[PDB]
């Protein structure tokens, strides 16, 4: 979270992998513009990414599946 990221590390299992996943999600929320899954609570997108990973709402597989779902739906909207 804000002070310690231990819970996120136990949820992913690797400091480095946690950084990569959290950066991907924060990029989604900062540029991609999509809404957070936890309340804002006046935090920078980085910390919302960490908080979401703390609750198990965001895992690398979850990010992959959401991205694939949206991309396949756009490809369906092509036709």
């Amino acid at each position: 979270a804000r002070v310690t990221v231990q819970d996120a590390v136990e949820k992913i299992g690797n400091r480095f992998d946690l950084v990569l996943v959290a950066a991907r999600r924060a990029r989604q929320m900062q540029v991609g513009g999509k809404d957070p899954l936890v309340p804002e609570e006046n935090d920078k997108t980085t910390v919302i990414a960490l908080r979401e990973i703390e609750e198990g709402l965001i895992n690398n597989q979850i990010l992959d599946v959401r991205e694939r779902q949206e991309q396949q739906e756009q490809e369906a909207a092509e036709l």
Binding site: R15, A23, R27, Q30
Partner: protein, 99 residues
């Protein structure tokens, strides 16, 4: 003393003011070792390319910050291919084996 952006040196194209805004903080070898120790590859990469030498990188990333997008498009530092020119001028053919 502080610095966000200012003068840049002539040959190496790397931070060095001094008149009003002085040169940036030197990020020496020992600190590169410290970041390698932490495993922080992205902080290192930005402290090598877009904060110091990468010209297209430095300006593009100032633009990105002003837009509110925090992202890096890093290239190759100026000092590296200055080194390539200086080695090439010793009659030694050093290149970059492209893909």
């Amino acid at each position: 003393h502080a610095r966000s952006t200012g003068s840049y040196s002539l040959v190496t194209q790397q931070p060095l003011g001094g008149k009003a805004q002085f040169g940036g903080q030197r990020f020496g070898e020992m600190e590169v070792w410290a970041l390698e120790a932490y495993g922080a590859a992205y902080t290192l990469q930005e402290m090598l390319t877009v904060k110091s030498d990468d010209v297209n990188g430095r300006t593009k990333m100032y633009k990105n910050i002003v837009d509110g997008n925090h992202q890096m498009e890093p290239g190759m530092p100026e000092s590296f291919n200055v080194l390539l020119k200086e080695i090439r001028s010793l009659g030694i053919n050093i290149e970059l084996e492209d893909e």
